[PDB]
Design a protein around this ligand. Structure first.
Ligand SMILES: [Mg+2]
Ligand SMILES: [Mg+2]
Ligand SMILES: [Mg+2]
Ligand SMILES: [Mg+2]
Ligand SMILES: [Mg+2]
Ligand SMILES: [Mg+2]
Ligand SMILES: [Mg+2]
Ligand SMILES: [Mg+2]
Ligand SMILES: [Mg+2]
Ligand SMILES: [Mg+2]
Ligand SMILES: [Mg+2]
Ligand SMILES: [Mg+2]
Ligand SMILES: [Mg+2]
Ligand SMILES: [Mg+2]
Ligand SMILES: [Mg+2]
Ligand SMILES: [Mg+2]
Ligand SMILES: [Mg+2]
Ligand SMILES: [Mg+2]
Ligand SMILES: [Mg+2]
Ligand SMILES: [Mg+2]
Lengths: 129, 55, 88, 71, 100
RNA sequence: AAGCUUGAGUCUCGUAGAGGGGGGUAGAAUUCCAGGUGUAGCGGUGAAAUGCGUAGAGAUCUGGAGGAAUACCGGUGGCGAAGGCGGCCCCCUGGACGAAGACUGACGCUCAGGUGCGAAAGCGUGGGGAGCAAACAGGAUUAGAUACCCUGGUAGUCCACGCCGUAAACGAUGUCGACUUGGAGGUUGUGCCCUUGAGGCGUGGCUUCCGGAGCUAACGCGUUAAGUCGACCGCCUGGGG
């Protein structure tokens, strides 16, 4: 059943690039705000707005450049049944450094480029391409 | 008419032998085809009224 | 004969708050009489089989309710097992 | 000694009683089971004596059709 | 307390027992807190199956909300009687001014 | 340790169903057992015969006993996890679904061993037994039909109480939850609108067909997933043996 709220966020983004829609509707959560903030500085997402009084509601806006999608392929590393942790000097480079590896450090959720040069280590969430 | 609560009044359509005949003796309107000839088949599941008295 | 008027006094047996259509000790009393009336039907009419399967989705419900209030308030179980005679 | 000795007729009658395998003399079959006592597993005695009735020594089972011969 | 409808018939050659059969059966269903919603008599009409030796038959139509504690012995009463041929019990029917 | 509600448990107010089980009742048909009436033919196979008949056959009417199955209504409709179950019909009782409002605040998903259910066939301890029908035997048939045709019948089918747990038990698809261009046929609830054109326009469950993107060798699936994610378990490491 529903045992992973993080995988539900990646499903709407992966399936949203093929349907060619504007924005999607999904309930927000603590981690979902930090994940959407990383993709907003990146060209991955445009802007998000939380406009629910009854409950937090996350509204993600996709970006379409030319006739191609911005999201290529998103995998899964930190599975609920199998967690994978890496060292500071063992951070995987997505797309030979071109990708954006969303990591979860101790100070917060940031990228993989600013993790090896500042702050401390963390847990790799997934591979956002 | 148009409702489905008219279950205690089918003595003018079907007979005792078990053969359903259209309303032709009195001579009224016969425009209600789906609400009469086709709506009677929906009540054949529970079949509260015996359709064939000879069986 | 399971009528709608005979189950009106079952909710009044357990009440924590006021003006409430629901308490914490009422989820078991509303399901205890339903299983108790079907357990006695094992002795007679042994040809029954569909009625025996239906108890698997009701008797096993009580095993999950025991681990719910166990880590919260232990004194809440001292009323349920001695009045509805559940698990001695 | 019923394990081996009351377990010879349970096997032997069955052949000599059935009208399909009854084309034999009682002594002829009294012999062919003391021979084949220690020949096939102790739960498969009559079972694999049917092999000597089909793979071997067959067509005499069912017999030559006397009710076709007199016919 | 539900709704019931006992529709039975009497003997064809015994037409004088019709006013005397319903009278002795309406007293047990009255003092048990029950009333009679509808009460119409059809008559000795014609049938379509000559199954009985004598094909006459009077139909009895009456509505009464008899409890369950009384229908267990009232239904078995018509079985021992020789004038009663068969019966018919429906379920969940309300009352009506007339049916035909 | 202390709370909330977006997944929804339960309950009040309703509707639909061969969901399951225990009694009772009705009709048709086959056959047996009794009268009247009618006698060398009847049943049955492209040719023949066995059986059944002059101790009243076959056929027909009436009546009675016993047993089994529910024709038309009946559509891949409805119900159940699966298997399976279609006569009106009493009692007991379960599941699912619709719908405006409260309360209780993840009591949630899945699994080895184990428990329970599981057609037909078969077996043990007791009944019923009119038909049909595995062995067995009469008549055909051919330098050999226990394959098929025809004439009978013991188990079994039915019923109470048990054991065994075997299928193409197939939807060759484990369950639960979430996301996802749409149209055209049925069944089953609650509303709006002029139900005055018995319909359009909304909101659910179940079921069938077609089809794009996408997925797969291919056929196909394709908003009930075999697509796109996630949680849990089982099986299979070449074809025979
Ligand atoms: Mg059984
Ligand atoms: Mg808590
Ligand atoms: Mg039923
Ligand atoms: Mg005669
Ligand atoms: Mg003569
Ligand atoms: Mg006759
Ligand atoms: Mg008999
Ligand atoms: Mg309030
Ligand atoms: Mg609260
Ligand atoms: Mg499960
Ligand atoms: Mg069987
Ligand atoms: Mg069986
Ligand atoms: Mg038996
Ligand atoms: Mg099947
Ligand atoms: Mg299989
Ligand atoms: Mg279903
Ligand atoms: Mg298709
Ligand atoms: Mg595939
Ligand atoms: Mg191998
Ligand atoms: Mg090998």
């Amino acid at each position: 059943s529903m045992q992973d709220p993080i995988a539900d966020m990646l499903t709407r983004i992966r399936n949203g690039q093929a349907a060619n829609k504007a924005a999607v509707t999904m309930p927000s959560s603590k981690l979902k705000v930090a994940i959407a903030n990383v993709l907003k500085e990146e060209g991955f997402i445009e802007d998000f707005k939380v406009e629910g009084d009854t409950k937090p509601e996350l509204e993600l806006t996709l970006k379409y450049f030319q006739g191609k999608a911005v999201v290529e392929s998103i995998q899964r590393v930190s599975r609920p049944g199998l967690r994978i942790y890496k060292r500071k000097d063992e951070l995987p480079k997505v797309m030979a450094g071109l990708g954006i590896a969303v990591v979860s450090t101790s100070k917060g959720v940031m990228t993989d480029r600013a993790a090896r040069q500042a702050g401390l280590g963390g847990e790799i969430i997934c591979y956002v391409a | 008419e148009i409702d489905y609560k008219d279950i205690a009044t089918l003595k003018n359509y079907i007979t005792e032998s078990g053969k359903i005949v259209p309303s032709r003796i009195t001579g009224t309107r016969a425009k209600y085809q789906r609400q009469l000839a086709r709506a009677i088949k929906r009540a054949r599941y529970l079949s509260l009224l015996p359709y064939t008295d000879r069986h | 004969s399971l009528s709608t008027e005979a189950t009106a006094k079952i909710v009044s047996e357990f009440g924590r708050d006021a003006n409430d259509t629901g308490s914490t000790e009422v989820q078991v009393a509303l399901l205890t009489a339903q299983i108790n009336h079907l357990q006695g039907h094992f002795a007679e009419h042994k040809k029954d089989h569909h009625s025996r399967r239906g108890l698997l989705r009701m008797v096993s419900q009580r095993r999950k309710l025991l681990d719910y209030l166990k880590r919260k308030d232990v004194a809440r179980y001292t009323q349920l097992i001695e009045r509805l005679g559940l698990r001695r | 000694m019923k394990t081996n000795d009351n377990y010879i007729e349970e096997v032997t009658a069955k052949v000599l009683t059935s009208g399909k395998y009854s084309t034999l003399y009682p002594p002829t079959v009294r012999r062919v089971t003391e021979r084949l006592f220690d020949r096939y597993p102790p739960k498969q005695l009559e079972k694999e004596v049917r092999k000597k009735l089909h793979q071997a020594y067959g067509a005499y089972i069912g017999g030559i059709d006397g009710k076709r011969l007199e016919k | 307390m539900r709704h019931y409808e006992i529709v039975f018939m009497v003997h064809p050659d015994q037409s004088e027992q019709v006013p005397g059969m319903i009278e002795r059966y309406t007293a047990a269903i009255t003092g048990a807190e029950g009333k009679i919603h509808r009460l119409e008599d059809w008559g000795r009409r014609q049938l379509a199956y000559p199954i009985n030796k004598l094909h006459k038959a009077h139909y009895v139509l009456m509505n009464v909300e008899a409890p369950q504690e009384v229908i267990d012995e009232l239904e078995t009463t018509f079985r021992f009687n020789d004038a009663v041929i068969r019966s018919m019990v429906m379920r969940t029917k309300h009352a009506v001014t007339e049916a035909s």
